[PDB]
Design a protein around this ligand. Sequence first.
Ligand SMILES: CCCCCCCC/C=C/CCCCCCCC(=O)OCCOC[C@H](OCCO)[C@H]1O[C@@H](OCCO)C[C@H]1OCCO
Ligand SMILES: CCCCCCCC/C=C/CCCCCCCC(=O)OCCOC[C@H](OCCO)[C@H]1O[C@@H](OCCO)C[C@H]1OCCO
Ligand SMILES: *[C@@H]1O[C@H](CO)[C@@H](O[C@@H]2O[C@H](CO)[C@@H](O)[C@H](O)[C@H]2NC(C)=O)[C@H](O)[C@H]1NC(C)=O
Ligand SMILES: *[C@@H]1O[C@H](CO)[C@@H](O[C@@H]2O[C@H](CO)[C@@H](O)[C@H](O)[C@H]2NC(C)=O)[C@H](O)[C@H]1NC(C)=O
Ligand SMILES: *[C@@H]1O[C@H](CO)[C@@H](O[C@@H]2O[C@H](CO)[C@@H](O)[C@H](O)[C@H]2NC(C)=O)[C@H](O)[C@H]1NC(C)=O
Ligand SMILES: *[C@@H]1O[C@H](CO)[C@@H](O[C@@H]2O[C@H](CO)[C@@H](O)[C@H](O)[C@H]2NC(C)=O)[C@H](O)[C@H]1NC(C)=O
Ligand SMILES: *[C@@H]1O[C@H](CO)[C@@H](O[C@@H]2O[C@H](CO)[C@@H](O)[C@H](O)[C@H]2NC(C)=O)[C@H](O)[C@H]1NC(C)=O
Ligand SMILES: *[C@@H]1O[C@H](CO)[C@@H](O[C@@H]2O[C@H](CO)[C@@H](O)[C@H](O)[C@H]2NC(C)=O)[C@H](O)[C@H]1NC(C)=O
Ligand SMILES: *[C@@H]1O[C@H](CO)[C@@H](O[C@@H]2O[C@H](CO)[C@@H](O)[C@H](O)[C@H]2NC(C)=O)[C@H](O)[C@H]1NC(C)=O
Ligand SMILES: *[C@@H]1O[C@H](CO)[C@@H](O[C@@H]2O[C@H](CO)[C@@H](O)[C@H](O)[C@H]2NC(C)=O)[C@H](O)[C@H]1NC(C)=O
Ligand SMILES: *[C@@H]1O[C@H](CO)[C@@H](O)[C@H](O)[C@H]1NC(C)=O
Ligand SMILES: *[C@@H]1O[C@H](CO)[C@@H](O)[C@H](O)[C@H]1NC(C)=O
Ligand SMILES: *[C@@H]1O[C@H](CO)[C@@H](O)[C@H](O)[C@H]1NC(C)=O
Ligand SMILES: *[C@@H]1O[C@H](CO)[C@@H](O)[C@H](O)[C@H]1NC(C)=O
Ligand SMILES: *[C@@H]1O[C@H](CO)[C@@H](O)[C@H](O)[C@H]1NC(C)=O
Ligand SMILES: *[C@@H]1O[C@H](CO)[C@@H](O)[C@H](O)[C@H]1NC(C)=O
Ligand SMILES: *[C@@H]1O[C@H](CO)[C@@H](O)[C@H](O)[C@H]1NC(C)=O
Ligand SMILES: *[C@@H]1O[C@H](CO)[C@@H](O)[C@H](O)[C@H]1NC(C)=O
Lengths: 49, 49, 98, 49, 277, 366, 49, 121, 49
Amino acid sequence: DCTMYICGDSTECSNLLLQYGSFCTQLNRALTGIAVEQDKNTQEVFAQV
Amino acid sequence: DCTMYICGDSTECSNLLLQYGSFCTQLNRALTGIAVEQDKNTQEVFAQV
Amino acid sequence: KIQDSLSSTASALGKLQDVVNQNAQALNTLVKQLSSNFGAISSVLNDILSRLDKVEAEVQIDRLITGRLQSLQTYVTQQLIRAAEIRASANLAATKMS
Amino acid sequence: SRLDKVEAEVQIDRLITGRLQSLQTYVTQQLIRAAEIRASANLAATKMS
Amino acid sequence: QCVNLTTRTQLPPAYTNSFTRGVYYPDKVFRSSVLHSTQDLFLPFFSNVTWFHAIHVTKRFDNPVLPFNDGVYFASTEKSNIIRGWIFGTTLDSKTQSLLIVNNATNVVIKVCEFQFCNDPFLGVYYHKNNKSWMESEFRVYSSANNCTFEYVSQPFLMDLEGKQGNFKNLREFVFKNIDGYFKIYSKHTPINLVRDLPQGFSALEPLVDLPIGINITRFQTLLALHRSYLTPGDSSSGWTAGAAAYYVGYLQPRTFLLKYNENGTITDAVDCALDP
Amino acid sequence: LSETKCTLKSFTVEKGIYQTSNFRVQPTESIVRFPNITNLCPFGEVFNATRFASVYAWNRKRISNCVADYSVLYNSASFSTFKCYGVSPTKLNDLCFTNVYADSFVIRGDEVRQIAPGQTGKIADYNYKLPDDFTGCVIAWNSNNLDSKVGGNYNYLYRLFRKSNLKPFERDISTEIYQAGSTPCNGVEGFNCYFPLQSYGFQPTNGVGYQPYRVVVLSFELLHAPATVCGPKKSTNLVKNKCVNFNFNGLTGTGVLTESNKKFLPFQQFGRDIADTTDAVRDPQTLEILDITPCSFGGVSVITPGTNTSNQVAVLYQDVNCWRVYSTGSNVFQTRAGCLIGAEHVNNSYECDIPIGAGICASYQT
Amino acid sequence: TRFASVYAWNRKRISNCVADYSVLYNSASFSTFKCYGVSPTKLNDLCFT
Amino acid sequence: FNFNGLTGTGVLTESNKKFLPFQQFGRDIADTTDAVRDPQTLEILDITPCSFGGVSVITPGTNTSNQVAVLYQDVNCWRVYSTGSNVFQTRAGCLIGAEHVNNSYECDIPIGAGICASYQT
Amino acid sequence: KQYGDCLGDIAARDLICAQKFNGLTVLPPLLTDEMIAQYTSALLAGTIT
Ligand SMILES: CCCCCCCC/C=C/CCCCCCCC(=O)OCCOC[C@H](OCCO)[C@H]1O[C@@H](OCCO)C[C@H]1OCCO
Ligand SMILES: CCCCCCCC/C=C/CCCCCCCC(=O)OCCOC[C@H](OCCO)[C@H]1O[C@@H](OCCO)C[C@H]1OCCO
Ligand SMILES: *[C@@H]1O[C@H](CO)[C@@H](O[C@@H]2O[C@H](CO)[C@@H](O)[C@H](O)[C@H]2NC(C)=O)[C@H](O)[C@H]1NC(C)=O
Ligand SMILES: *[C@@H]1O[C@H](CO)[C@@H](O[C@@H]2O[C@H](CO)[C@@H](O)[C@H](O)[C@H]2NC(C)=O)[C@H](O)[C@H]1NC(C)=O
Ligand SMILES: *[C@@H]1O[C@H](CO)[C@@H](O[C@@H]2O[C@H](CO)[C@@H](O)[C@H](O)[C@H]2NC(C)=O)[C@H](O)[C@H]1NC(C)=O
Ligand SMILES: *[C@@H]1O[C@H](CO)[C@@H](O[C@@H]2O[C@H](CO)[C@@H](O)[C@H](O)[C@H]2NC(C)=O)[C@H](O)[C@H]1NC(C)=O
Ligand SMILES: *[C@@H]1O[C@H](CO)[C@@H](O[C@@H]2O[C@H](CO)[C@@H](O)[C@H](O)[C@H]2NC(C)=O)[C@H](O)[C@H]1NC(C)=O
Ligand SMILES: *[C@@H]1O[C@H](CO)[C@@H](O[C@@H]2O[C@H](CO)[C@@H](O)[C@H](O)[C@H]2NC(C)=O)[C@H](O)[C@H]1NC(C)=O
Ligand SMILES: *[C@@H]1O[C@H](CO)[C@@H](O[C@@H]2O[C@H](CO)[C@@H](O)[C@H](O)[C@H]2NC(C)=O)[C@H](O)[C@H]1NC(C)=O
Ligand SMILES: *[C@@H]1O[C@H](CO)[C@@H](O[C@@H]2O[C@H](CO)[C@@H](O)[C@H](O)[C@H]2NC(C)=O)[C@H](O)[C@H]1NC(C)=O
Ligand SMILES: *[C@@H]1O[C@H](CO)[C@@H](O)[C@H](O)[C@H]1NC(C)=O
Ligand SMILES: *[C@@H]1O[C@H](CO)[C@@H](O)[C@H](O)[C@H]1NC(C)=O
Ligand SMILES: *[C@@H]1O[C@H](CO)[C@@H](O)[C@H](O)[C@H]1NC(C)=O
Ligand SMILES: *[C@@H]1O[C@H](CO)[C@@H](O)[C@H](O)[C@H]1NC(C)=O
Ligand SMILES: *[C@@H]1O[C@H](CO)[C@@H](O)[C@H](O)[C@H]1NC(C)=O
Ligand SMILES: *[C@@H]1O[C@H](CO)[C@@H](O)[C@H](O)[C@H]1NC(C)=O
Ligand SMILES: *[C@@H]1O[C@H](CO)[C@@H](O)[C@H](O)[C@H]1NC(C)=O
Ligand SMILES: *[C@@H]1O[C@H](CO)[C@@H](O)[C@H](O)[C@H]1NC(C)=O
């Protein structure tokens, strides 16, 4: 959670962070890819039969 | 094209960007490697015979 | 049956379409990230250069330059990481051909 | 607590830039590690078969 | 001269949903075919707006003093021009300054004076037989106004005072904000054909005016017009008929919205990013 | 070829094909389109006034439809303070201003420092506060000759007590008894019950810190909305379909101007794209929407054998269909990767030497 | 009544008190007031060590 | 809160920590203030953030429906946006808005820890 | 890990609480360990018989 890591509970920091929203969407896109790939790894190794 | 992405048609931005020239040469070096590798991939798959 | 299954369903070639989509989305994200202020008073160089003189303008233009260079660096790093995986797939396809 | 909302932004933008770069470094290294884990999982899926 | 009103019946307050209404153009920059994310004071989606009206020759005549927390969404469905404006202030007496926006059937008057407002401010419309004519008759709003730092009077006009009979035809939406000494108003007139409630729809309000009034505003009150004629044989305090009109009041909050700009420059849809997951 | 030599940072180039900067076009003219306003701004009524206001009830004046040639003040006026916020002083002549308001009042000399964003003090707390994100200029000048009379001048008041600080640009003209204790004041001054306004005492021989100062605060926005007040810039003719430097209501830039399909609402002056760059503008003199397009466009690659072998080059203009080329001559060949200029096209087929793209290769042969 | 010479300047400890500097608004007038490491509009909300 | 000028947001609870007489605040590894001594009563208190816990929303296409189920990992069914019928506790968190069936199907929407969701009649 | 478990100084003491209070979540895998064990027992029963 970008806003919680960078800004915590600060509202001013969040309003300032609204400039960098594409970068956080990008970070979470990459992490989501990694996560579904972990599940696909386990599938391709164990669910052959 | 670094100068077009970062600076557009601005001459002042270009003169200021002349400090970061190694970084743009580096970026384009990496991208050029990727491009010739794409061509090598297609070669190694299809031009075996 | 192969031919009919291909001619009926539209999303059978999911992996190739995913490659195409990922490249297109990376470029479009790189274009959209030109709207970031990166801490400057504006994200438009012409706005900054219209309002501020050449000494107060550099403080903002250097912020914009640092941010946009970091955007390009992120794009290139992710392209290298994706090219490694595409090259693994191409080596597998070259092994399957042989 | 110490600075008003105009002097505070100069510092908060520094903090935001730094923390976003921290997250970016984390995600980049997670992608590089996930590539190696995926190579290992492909090898394990080949050894299974 | 500042009469109080009697013969009003007592009814509980009503409530109504805000089916995605109250969106306004955030800036003055033109955009097309783009989804623009914006954070600003906005009326949240499916909000709980309070319902007031004036009805039944007199049963209901609602003009209470409402709060003005950070901004007001104000809608009014009417057919015979009963809503005439508002009063904005903090104590609404002559100790402090107040903002008066009123349409006296002839001009739009915007004043920032020190008004000594009435307990029941209203305007009057009289209906004459042997004429079948309705004419502006009363302006019982304030007792006095001394130190008046701002004033605007529009170009003259004549708007029809006839009481219409039928459905509500006109929906008029207004967003009022008070920031940095400016009183911002955004408006949108929409034709309707409806009986009872808020028309569920979407319409983006357009910037109307920024007034440099520079006052503190915490409460406000709506200015209605009542009808008086031979059918109302009482005195000033008792004997008058309301007509038919209703207005709704919602409050703005700092929200993030995702606005959808058309291929032309119009906002056609929006998302309330904090409504639900 | 020299762009490559500089990019490689060497005087030698190996055989190959190299990307260079995109095709650039330089602007041929400069364009200035400001509105056709003629009146000079009321510098006389604002700066040269018989009576200024008290700081507690400060005056706001709307400025519209005028030319802000402030060099008319050079002959008569002299300012101890002139600080601009969000704009540079040397840029005011090339800019149009959006919602100009002039705030004016008279304060003590020791309080001019308090008219600035983020200040505290008796003025900034109780009389006149500037917002933190203030765009405009603050002007002040000593007025001891005009505003100080022998025996003290007691016309200028200021609020001394107030239950809470003012908001930005908020005005408080209330005059009710300030209750400084817990016991109530029933509208009469007494013990811990003070009238909230006190008068400056402006004797002529007061020290410079206690001498009257006339302050003017100008508020505006820049480059976001239609503007009527504009700086002194001589306006030129409109040039379309050509790479020009433009200046529309203060917004500078470079590009090609063409007529547009867009319809701006009457309160709109600029249009922006996803990257927030201005891509449409309404001409201030003739209200017509125009579209702004960059001049530089199109990728360029230079094909070289080693500079050790030759100094000939062929240039590939992807995104050109043979023109927007650096030079043309003989040997213009249209490939699917772009227009190739400087290479002779043969009909034989060989193994690839220098990959050009889309099935075409180049080589240095006899 | 008496201030010190700059060469032998006086240092005074302040403790156990409430800093409501608005009591100076009636009597004092300062040509210079510059704060370092803190914003002037924040002094009412802080406690000083 | 505002403790001696230090502002912030959180939940205050009584602490095991013992501050030396010259100490007023306590910080964690990230240097955020996590303990404070109350100035009026000299008792140590612990500051804990208010926001906590991951949330996922499960949707069929908005083209198909506007129903959603929300998964609150780190909740054991509450700290939920809304509750009603259909509260199901999985090992990945509390799932609210989905009906739990006894059959087993191939995965449609992976929820985690062996649970999947789908939009069926 | 519930909020009532991280409530108090256990937040600073535990590492997972410190991660969760800063927006860093660990998502559970899709296949449980029992399911992976069923897959391996199926592979064993297929290869044995
Ligand atoms: C100290 C420095 C000074 C600076 C000065 C800057 C600001 C001064 C300018 C003020 C212009 C205000 C324009 C908005 C209302 C007048 C609108 C107008 O000039 O046309 C008159 C027709 O009315 C149109 C409007 O609505 C049109 C539909 O009839 C009216 O409808 C009325 O309510 C509905 C009853 O019909 C009220 C009123 O608008 C309310 C204002 O918020
Ligand atoms: C310009 C404007 C500024 C005005 C005010 C600013 C600040 C002035 C405050 C001064 C407080 C000083 C107190 C600290 C040491 C005194 C120690 C004390 O108030 O307790 C007395 C008991 O002694 C404890 C200490 O040690 C306790 C063990 O006996 C002593 O031991 C001694 O040496 C060991 C022999 O027993 C010396 C001494 O401490 C040395 C000081 O460094
Ligand atoms: C209308 O009614 C209000 C109260 O409902 C009257 O205001 C009161 O006036 C009396 C004496 O004039 C005061 O003792 C009360 O304290 C007032 N109440 C309020 C709320 O201010 C008002 O005078 C009436 N107006 C007329 C002319 O009938
Ligand atoms: C509506 O309000 C306007 C503004 O007060 C009234 O017009 C003014 O009338 C007075 C008295 O004749 C004049 O002194 C002002 O100069 C007028 N103002 C302007 C500029 O129009 C108007 O009479 C009112 N109409 C009704 C029906 O009450
Ligand atoms: C018909 O309308 C006219 C004006 O349009 C009315 O004339 C005025 O009416 C008021 C109140 O009735 C009187 O105080 C004025 O003295 C009248 N002035 C004129 C010009 O006559 C007229 O009264 C209306 N007819 C009826 C029957 O009410
Ligand atoms: C606000 O109103 C008060 C009360 O009318 C004004 O004070 C009077 O102003 C006149 C004109 O200068 C003087 O002749 C009186 O002696 C003043 N005293 C009173 C209480 O009557 C005051 O000037 C007005 N102006 C502002 C903006 O404060
Ligand atoms: C957008 O603007 C256009 C131009 O004002 C509106 O008019 C449409 O224009 C197109 C192209 O000429 C025509 O094909 C349509 O028939 C026009 N529509 C009508 C009936 O006016 C258009 O309505 C606006 N809105 C949208 C959503 O396109
Ligand atoms: C705007 O007006 C409100 C109401 O008059 C003010 O709020 C009051 O503030 C005083 C202290 O300044 C308190 O004693 C009252 O209890 C408050 N009343 C309410 C309803 O909150 C507010 O302070 C004014 N705004 C400014 C900037 O002064
Ligand atoms: C360069 O332009 C020419 C025409 O200007 C293109 O040739 C045309 O290609 C289209 C393909 O859809 C054909 O329908 C036309 O009949 C062709 N015209 C001629 C004159 O042959 C050519 O394709 C363009 N070059 C590239 C590589 O894009
Ligand atoms: C949610 O809470 C319940 C109890 O509040 C947990 O169920 C317990 O699990 C432990 C495992 O160590 C058993 O020892 C207890 O006997 C169980 N209690 C009951 C009454 O069932 C449950 O595991 C928690 N949910 C998750 C997924 O963590
Ligand atoms: C609107 O608010 C009132 C005030 O409590 C409440 O009774 C009513 O239920 C709310 N409306 C809805 C439908 O939420
Ligand atoms: C200001 O006013 C004085 C006297 O009215 C006049 O002499 C002087 O020229 C004026 N300055 C200008 C040029 O505005
Ligand atoms: C001046 O501008 C107006 C628009 O306000 C325009 O109608 C008029 O033709 C212009 N005159 C010129 C172009 O000189
Ligand atoms: C390349 O360089 C070497 C040494 O500079 C030279 O001997 C050789 O002749 C050059 N190649 C050609 C073909 O000119
Ligand atoms: C190549 O062949 C085509 C047709 O075969 C002919 O028109 C063209 O002139 C030839 N080009 C050369 C270089 O002779
Ligand atoms: C005031 O603070 C002291 C600590 O110095 C404390 O002992 C006393 O009880 C406090 N009084 C209160 C809480 O009013
Ligand atoms: C999905 O979208 C398409 C086109 O909008 C529509 O035809 C289809 O009915 C939608 N699916 C469902 C199940 O509603
Ligand atoms: C599912 O099965 C369990 C026992 O295996 C039983 O307790 C429960 O009631 C069943 N639910 C349904 C909907 O069949």
